[PDB]
Write a protein that binds this ligand. Structure first.
Ligand SMILES: CC(=O)N1CCC[C@@H]1C(=O)NCC#CBr
Length: 129
């Protein structure tokens, strides 16, 4: 896409050690599945296209972009070594939305609904086995 949007986060790298764990399987099969299909998922399912949204300051503000499309590819590609890496990616996606936008805002209300569901699912994350 546009040269004015940054390259998206890495989803493949042969140099990075990778593992499947039961927690990571849970994050794909339960957590990501549940959030992906939620009514309010759609603004988070791909990187922010700052050109299409006419937000030329977006990547001036947000220097650690993350989206659930990236997270889904990372899980499907077995990119992570542990669950914490993937939980941190979800936390970074929510925080970016709250930093860029204002407490009133539609997208913030949507992210807050998704975050509440994500935290309920993390409360049920199994012990690593
Ligand atoms: C980080 C963030 O803002 N996000 C995540 C999803 C897209 C959203 C955004 O920028 N546009 C939505 C509205 C308004 Br103005």
């Amino acid at each position: 896409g546009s040269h004015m949007n940054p390259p998206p986060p890495e989803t493949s790298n042969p140099n990075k050690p990778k593992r499947q764990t039961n927690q990571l399987q849970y994050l794909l099969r339960v957590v990501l599945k549940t959030l992906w299909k939620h009514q309010f998922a759609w603004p988070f399912q791909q990187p922010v296209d700052a050109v299409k949204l006419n937000l030329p300051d977006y990547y001036k503000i947000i220097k650690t972009p993350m989206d659930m499309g990236t997270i889904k590819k990372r899980l499907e590609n077995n990119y992570y070594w542990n669950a914490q890496e993937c939980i941190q990616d979800f936390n970074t996606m929510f925080t970016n939305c709250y930093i860029y936008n204002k407490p009133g805002d539609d997208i913030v209300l949507m992210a807050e609904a998704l975050e509440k569901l994500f935290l309920q699912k993390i409360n049920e994350l199994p012990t690593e086995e």
